[PDB]
Amino acid sequence: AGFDKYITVFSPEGSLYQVEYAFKAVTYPGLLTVAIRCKDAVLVVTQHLIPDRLMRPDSVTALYEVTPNIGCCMTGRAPDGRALVQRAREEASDYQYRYGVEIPIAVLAKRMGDKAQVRTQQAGLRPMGVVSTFIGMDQSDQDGSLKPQIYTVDPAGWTGGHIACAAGKKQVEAMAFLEKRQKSTELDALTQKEAAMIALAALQSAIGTAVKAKEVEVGRCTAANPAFQRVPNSEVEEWLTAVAE
Amino acid sequence: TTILAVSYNGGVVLAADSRTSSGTYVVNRASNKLTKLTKKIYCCRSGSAADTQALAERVSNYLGSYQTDIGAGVNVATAANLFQKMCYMNRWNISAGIIVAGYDPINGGSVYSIPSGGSCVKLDYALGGSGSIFLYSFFDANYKPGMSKSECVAFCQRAVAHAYSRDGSSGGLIRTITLDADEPEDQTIPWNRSPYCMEKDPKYVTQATQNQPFSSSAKITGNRMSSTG
Numbered sequence: 001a002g003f004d005k006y007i008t009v010f011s012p013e014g015s016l017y018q019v020e021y022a023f024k025a026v027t028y029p030g031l032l033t034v035a036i037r038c039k040d041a042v043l044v045v046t047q048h049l050i051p052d053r054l055m056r057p058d059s060v061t062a063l064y065e066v067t068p069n070i071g072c073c074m075t076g077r078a079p080d081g082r083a084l085v086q087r088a089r090e091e092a093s094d095y096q097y098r099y100g101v102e103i104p105i106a107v108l109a110k111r112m113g114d115k116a117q118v119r120t121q122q123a124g125l126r127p128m129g130v131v132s133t134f135i136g137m138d139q140s141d142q143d144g145s146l147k148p149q150i151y152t153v154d155p156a157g158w159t160g161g162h163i164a165c166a167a168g169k170k171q172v173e174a175m176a177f178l179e180k181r182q183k184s185t186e187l188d189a190l191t192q193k194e195a196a197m198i199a200l201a202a203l204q205s206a207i208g209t210a211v212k213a214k215e216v217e218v219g220r221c222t223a224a225n226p227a228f229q230r231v232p233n234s235e236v237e238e239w240l241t242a243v244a245e
Numbered sequence: 246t247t248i249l250a251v252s253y254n255g256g257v258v259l260a261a262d263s264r265t266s267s268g269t270y271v272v273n274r275a276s277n278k279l280t281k282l283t284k285k286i287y288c289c290r291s292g293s294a295a296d297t298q299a300l301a302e303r304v305s306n307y308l309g310s311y312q313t314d315i316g317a318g319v320n321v322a323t324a325a326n327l328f329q330k331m332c333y334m335n336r337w338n339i340s341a342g343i344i345v346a347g348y349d350p351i352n353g354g355s356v357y358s359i360p361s362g363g364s365c366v367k368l369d370y371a372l373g374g375s376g377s378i379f380l381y382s383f384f385d386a387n388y389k390p391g392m393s394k395s396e397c398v399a400f401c402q403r404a405v406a407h408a409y410s411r412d413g414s415s416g417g418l419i420r421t422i423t424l425d426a427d428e429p430e431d432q433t434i435p436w437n438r439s440p441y442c443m444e445k446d447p448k449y450v451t452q453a454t455q456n457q458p459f460s461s462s463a464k465i466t467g468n469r470m471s472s473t474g
């Protein structure tokens with residue numbers, strides 16, 4: 001009853017205060033990401049803003065490659081996100097050596113949520129103040145096709161699939177735009193051009209700025225080219241004009 | 246097993262037979278001794294079928310985990326120092342002759358021959374396997390450096406076909422692949438369309454006159470093919 005909040009100890013209302021304080025390290029940099037999957041692709045947009053003009057803008061990034069078919073964005077404390085990439089690259093490689101096949105995206109999200117649960121149960125270890133968003137396309141069963149996947153793991157360890165997610169500062173106004181857009185159409189029937197307009201407009205409704213094409217970076221995975229790659233900046237400009245239309 | 250890798254201007258040409266044989270019996274006549282490490286770097290594979298398969302997929306997982314962390318392409322000299330490290334600290338327990346050949350944009354086409362002793366030598370062409378001892382005097386006479394891509398494919402297919410004609414260990418198909426700045430093109434020509442075989446070699450048509458007829462003279466007149474005459 002002396003501290004109640006300084007190490008991983010249950011509060012008298014049954015909460016962990018080092019979990020609730022690590023959620024606030026996600027919104028503390030002030031950034032934002034939006035992920036969405038269409039019928040045949042996955043998209044991840046994120047705010048890529050450099051305040052200093054003397055900074056090399058192609059070094060600071062949040063989009064990482066875990067395996068050649070899984071990409072991720074790390075929204076939260078930026079050196080903590082680089083730490084969980086190196087953890088996920090070890091787990092995807094040790095899956096490859098031991099089991100011979102590439103790791104499923106739903107399984108790589110589960111094995112990274114088990115790493116976050118241990119750090120919030122042992123008293124000495126600090127939780128990672130970052131929300132991971134592992135995106136990719138899994139091999140479907142009984143037909144052999146590919147299927148878009150989005151998986152998000154909290155700093156507590158809450159893994160789960162998504163149709164469209166958001167993380168960072170004013171992530172509540174980004175969820176509210178996507179649910180309002182969900183009431184009209186059905187997001188698993190839209191195309192890659194149509195779904196790119198929503199994830200960029202959801203990034204506009206929260207920041208209220210209608211940002212430039214260099215102030216974001218977008219990575220994608222498509223059923224034709226299943227490898228994770230980031231888009232060119234010229235293709236973001238073809239999308240930002242359509243949102244203004 | 247007869248494996249070889251030859252460099253041209255663009256990239257390299259890997260060439261190998263297809264036969265794993267337990268001493269004297271052909272367990273597999275359609276083996277694949279050309280192992281993919283990365284997209285542009287392969288390795289030829291001779292010796293123990295299990296000891297070299299475990300090395301080839303242990304290097305290929307270090308090499309793909311390296312490529313993701315770097316974010317660029319893997320050099321061939323990088324992949325040839327991961328076989329040398331493993332074939333030297335296991336050299337008393339494995340039987341492994343590896344020829345590593347590939348393509349990188351920095352150095353072009355590279356060929357590394359890693360013998361059973363565990364050394365590493367960078368070459369223009371490499372030979373390996375039990376059938377390679379036939380091909381030293383064949384490359385001393387018939388090989389001229391600086392061929393094109395289409396000439397190195399027809400040469401290495403003609404090179405392997407002279408090797409498994411005399412070797413008992415080697416035989417089967419001829420699996421070749423080229424690794425250069427284009428997409429990797431593979432080609433598997435069979436035995437019955439091989440560029441050389443001793444059965445259709447027109448100087449081995451006449452039987453050696455061993456089974457002489459019972460005659461009155463020392464004049465050798467060929468074999469005895471019938472009971473009457």
Ligand SMILES: *[B]([O])([O])[C]([C][C]([C])[C])[N]C(=O)[C]([C]C1=[C][C]=[C][C]=[C]1)[N]C(=O)C1=[C]N=[C][C]=N1
Pocket residue numbers: 246247264265266267268272276278290291292293294295297340374375414415
């Ligand atoms: B080649 O004949 O050397 C071949 C190379 C291998 C890496 C595909 N090796 C084998 O055929 C070996 C036998 C051998 C022959 C000559 C030298 C060294 C080894 N085959 C096997 O190891 C084997 C035997 N029985 C079952 C499975 N594998």
